Design a protein. Structure first.
Lengths: 75, 75, 75, 75, 75, 75
């Protein structure tokens, strides 16, 4: 006989407080990018960037993350 | 005989407070990008960027994330 | 005999408060992009960008995310 | 009695030969300029440029110059 | 009694030959410029540039110069 | 008695020959400039540049110069 009981209990807090958030300046001075390739072959589950001059300002008021995997395998 | 009981309990909080959010300046000075290729072959589940000059200002008032995966496999 | 009971309980909060959100300036100074290719072959589930000069201002008042996957497989 | 005999002689050549002139690429990636002032006071014979993002391609087939000043002053 | 005789003789050559002129690439990656002032006072014979991001391609087939002054002063 | 005889003689050559001129690449990677001032006072015969991010490609097929001052003063 097999009995499997899977009862995780989660009471977690992920939390932040900020009084104020601001006066943020992102002022990048350009630039130059060159890429040479011949053949690209991309297959299962690829994340790729080639030849980029990207500027990102990311200012979340919270920006909190919780990541949670439950896996049960029986054979 | 097999009994499998799967009862995860989740009371999670992902939370934030901000009193004010602002005064954000994103002012990029241009730039230059060149890419050369001959052949691109992309198959299953490819995320790709080639030859980009992208500017992003992302300012969510919260921007909080919960990611929660439940997998039960019986063979 | 097999009994499988799958009863996840979820009371999750994903939440945010912002008193004010604003005074955001996105002012990009142009730029230049060149891409050369000969052949593009894209098959299942491809997300692709080629030769881009994109400006994005994304300011959600919340922008909170919950992603929740339940998979039960019986073979 | 005073005699002034001002007789300059000039058989100068300013000259060029070019067999072919070309394949010229001027390809600038943008940029960003900011100038702050409160007061400008410009008087006689002022040449001024303030806050400029200027692109010039100048390709004369000759572009040769002769500058020649003659000045006789008597008091 | 005074005699002034002023007879410069000029047979000068300023000269060039080029068989071909070309394949010139001017390709600048942007940039960022900021200038702060309060008061500018410019008087006689001022040549001025303030806050500039200038790109120049100058390709004269000759571009030869002769500059020449002939001053006679009698008091 | 005064006799002043001014007879300069000039037979000179300034000269160049080039078989071919080319394959020139000027490719600058941007950059950043900040200047702070309060008062500028400019008077007779001033040549000035303040806060610049300038790119110059200068390719004369000749580019030869002759500068020539003749001056005579009498009292
Ligand atoms: N999620 C993505 C794709 F689907 C494809 C290409 C990517 C390239 N880059 C990032 N990336 C994230 C954070 C970071 C920081 C610095 N550089 C790069 C970064 C994420 C990608
Ligand atoms: N979600 C996406 C696609 F479907 C295809 C291409 C992508 C390229 N890039 C990102 N990416 C995310 C964050 C980050 C940060 C820096 N660079 C790159 C980034 C995401 C992509
Ligand atoms: N969802 C998409 C498509 F269906 C196809 C192409 C894409 C390229 N890019 C992004 N992307 C997202 C975030 C980010 C950040 C930076 N660069 C790139 C990004 C998303 C894409
Ligand atoms: N002739 C002019 C005016 F009447 C007033 C302003 C000027 C500003 N600049 C130039 N100038 C010439 C060549 C060069 C090269 C680089 N930067 C600047 C230049 C000339 C002007
Ligand atoms: N002729 C002019 C004006 F009437 C007023 C401003 C000027 C600023 N600059 C130049 N200039 C010439 C050659 C060079 C090279 C580099 N930087 C600057 C230059 C010339 C000017
Ligand atoms: N002719 C000019 C003006 F009337 C006013 C400003 C100037 C600033 N700069 C130059 N200049 C020439 C050659 C060089 C090389 C490097 N830097 C600077 C240069 C020339 C000017």
């Amino acid at each position: 006989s097999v009995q499997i009981v899977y009862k995780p209990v989660d009471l977690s807090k992920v939390t932040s407080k900020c009084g104020s958030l601001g006066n943020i300046h992102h002022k990048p001075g350009g630039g130059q990018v060159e890429v040479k390739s011949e053949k690209l072959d991309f297959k299962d589950r690829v994340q790729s960037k080639i030849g980029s001059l990207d500027n990102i300002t990311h200012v979340p008021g919270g920006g909190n993350k919780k990541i949670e995997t439950h896996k049960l395998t029986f054979r």
